[PDB]
């Protein structure tokens, strides 16, 4: 078999990152588990008047660099291991992009598609009331993640604000603009993924105009990224869905698909001639972008991948043995910790704007975002080729450095 546990696999790279950086075993012991993990039971009155109690998680990986940052996930597969690994990745993202953050993450075991608007609101208010003692603008700043959105952020912001007895926009990011959100929040992730595609393309000497790209997933990341790739002149040879995939060697009509895709990012069920997801990962292209879920590139298929570049818009799409197979095959892997930092970057700008009470325009957010994604790409890429290591390990090296140095400076690990 292969190790598919998101948590223990992430631990192993962090351990190697910290050893290559020269730290003592105690720094791996301090960073391998979140400093705080709160598990909570949340009762919600359901539309039929009965009560359901939901299990929720809030993980705070490390406090050392500043308040922890990370989204909240509503899914029936939310586990404590996933929430921790997600939380550790947010530490590394924030490090790579140099934010005064540590990593946080949250999750609630629920099926949100089976719940009404009112039930979602009461679940969201309960979650904030359950965890409020350890979160806030100066402690831990949640945000959206898949299946949670601006309306849920608005509800959670409202509930936190009523408890404080004053508006706290800085508690949570991904807010609507009228609630103190930021320009650029919707396209931030895919816009960040587009920048590392362009930078990876330059390394490999691929012209984007005419480049064959394939995208697994058609949600916020996938569908925004397809639009960006399309009117950048790339041919989006295939897009994917929780239910199937589409393939066109001329490149797909992305506008046509965006017009018919639902809020949950599914569009494949409209077509008869579908292709499987395992086929989509394997078709010949220049850029493969996994932007769906975790562990889609494994040991069973990492040899069959034909892209020259694969960039991880999604969290944890490729496994440890896949990364080693890919890098041995000469692929330019751009790890998720790098490629998706665009969403954490813009979420941080939202927070900065909330701290000052003053708000930035699109062009200013885009300007500051591009600087960060550009400079942070060179950092990880230069580290990989200078230490003769794979790109993920190098991104972990770049991302864990601030947290380790802060934990040292503060006295958490001595010597």
Ligand X SMILES: NC(=O)c1ccc[n+]([C@@H]2O[C@H](COP(=O)([O-])OP(=O)(O)OC[C@H]3O[C@@H](n4cnc5c(N)ncnc54)[C@H](O)[C@@H]3O)[C@@H](O)[C@H]2O)c1
Residues 398 and 383 sit within 8 Å (Cβ to Cβ): yes
The answer to whether the annotation marks 315 as part of a ligand binding site is yes
Q: Between the CA atoms of 154, 156, 158 and 161, what dihedral angle is there, to the nearest 10 degrees?
A: -130
Closest separation in Å from C-beta 113 to a second copy? 5
Binding of a second copy at residue 409 (CB under 8 A)? yes
Alpha-carbon distance of 170 to 310, in angstroms, equals: 35
- Residue 286 binds which entry of ligand X, a second copy, none, CB below 5-8 Å type-dependent: none
The answer to whether the annotation marks 384 as part of a ligand binding site is no
Instruction: Concatenate the DSSP letters of all residues of 222-271 into one string.
Output: HHHHHHHHHTTT-EEEEEE-SS-EEE-TT---HHHHHTT--TTS--GGG-
Task: List the beta bridge partners of residue 245.
Answer: 240, 275
Q: Which of 129, 359, 370, 374 binds a second copy (CB under 8 A)?
A: 359
Q: Which of 30, 191, 402, 413 binds a second copy (CB under 8 A)?
A: 402
Pattern 132-171, a second copy, x by CB under 8 A = ----x-xx------xx-xxx--xx-xx------xxxxx--
Alpha-carbon distance of 143 to 150, in angstroms, equals: 9
Residues 106 and 57 sit within 8 Å (Cβ to Cβ): yes
By CB under 6 A, the residues from 175 to 234 that bind ligand X are 189-190, 193, 216-222
The answer to whether the annotation marks 250 as part of a ligand binding site is no
- Residue 366 binds which entry of a second copy, ligand X, none, CB below 5-8 Å type-dependent: none
Residues 156 and 124 sit within 8 Å (Cβ to Cβ): yes
The label of the residue with tokens 């931030």 reads 188
Binding of a second copy at residue 106 (CB under 8 A)? no
- Which sequence positions are flagged as catalytic? 105
The answer to whether the annotation marks 20 as part of a ligand binding site is no
Q: Which of 96, 313, 332, 380 binds ligand X (CB under 6 A)?
A: 313
Binding of ligand X at residue 350 (CB under 6 A)? no
Residues 384 and 211 sit within 8 Å (Cβ to Cβ): no
* Region from 59-67, 198-206, 236-244, 323-331 binding ligand X, contact rule CB under 6 A: 236-244
DSSP 9: H
Closest C-alpha to 66, from 414, 355, 312, 357: 355
Closest separation in Å from C-beta 263 to a second copy? 4
Binding of a second copy at residue 76 (CB under 8 A)? yes
Chain center to CA of 299: 23
Q: Which of 71, 126, 181, 184 binds ligand X (CB under 6 A)?
A: 71
For ligand X, which is the closer residue by CB, 220 or 353? Answer: 220
- Residue 55 binds which entry of a second copy, ligand X, none, CB below 5-8 Å type-dependent: none
């Amino acid at each position: 078999a292969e190790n598919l546990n998101l948590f223990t696999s992430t631990q192993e790279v962090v351990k190697e990152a910290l050893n290559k950086l020269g730290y003592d075993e105690a720094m791996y012991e301090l960073l391998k588990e979140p400093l705080r993990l709160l598990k909570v039971r949340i009762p919600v009155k359901m539309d039929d008047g009965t009560t359901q109690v939901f299990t929720g998680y809030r993980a705070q990986h490390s406090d050392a660099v500043g308040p922890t940052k990370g989204g909240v996930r509503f899914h029936p597969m939310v586990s404590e291991d996933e929430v921790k690994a997600l939380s550790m990745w947010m530490t590394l993202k924030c490090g790579i992009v140099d934010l005064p953050y540590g990593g946080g993450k949250g999750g609630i075991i629920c099926d949100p598609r089976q719940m009404s608007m009112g039930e979602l609101e009461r679940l969201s208010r309960g979650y904030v009331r359950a965890i409020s003692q350890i979160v806030g603008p100066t402690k831990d700043i949640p945000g959206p993640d898949m299946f949670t959105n601006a309306q849920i952020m608005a509800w959670m912001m409202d509930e936190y604000s009523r408890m404080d007895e004053f508006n706290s926009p800085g508690f949570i990011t991904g807010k609507p603009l009228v609630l103190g959100g930021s320009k650029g929040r919707d396209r931030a992730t895919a816009e960040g993924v587009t920048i590392v595609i362009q930078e990876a393309a330059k390394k490999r000497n691929i012209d984007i105009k005419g480049a064959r790209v394939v995208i697994q997933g058609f949600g916020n990341a996938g569908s925004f990224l397809a639009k960006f790739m399309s009117d950048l002149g790339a041919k989006v040879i295939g897009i994917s869905d929780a239910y199937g995939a589409l393939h066109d060697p001329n490149g797909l009509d992305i506008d046509y698909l965006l017009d018919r895709r639902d809020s949950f990012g599914t569009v494949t069920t409209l077509f008869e001639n579908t292709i499987t997801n395992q086929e989509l990962l394997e078709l010949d292209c220049d850029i493969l972008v996994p932007a769906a879920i975790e562990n889609q590139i494994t040991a069973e298929n990492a040899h069959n991948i034909k892209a020259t570049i694969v960039v991880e818009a999604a969290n944890g799409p490729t496994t440890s043995e896949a990364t080693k197979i890919l890098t041995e095959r000469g692929i330019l892997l751009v790890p998720d910790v790098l490629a998706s930092a665009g969403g954490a970057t813009v979420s941080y700008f939202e927070w900065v704007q909330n701290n000052m009470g003053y708000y930035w325009e699109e062009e200013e957010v885009q300007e500051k975002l591009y600087k960060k994604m550009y400079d942070s790409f060179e950092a990880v890429y230069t580290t990989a080729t200078t230490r003769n290591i794979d790109m993920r390990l190098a991104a972990y090296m770049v991302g864990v450095r601030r947290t380790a140095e802060a934990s040292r400076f503060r006295g958490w690990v001595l010597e």
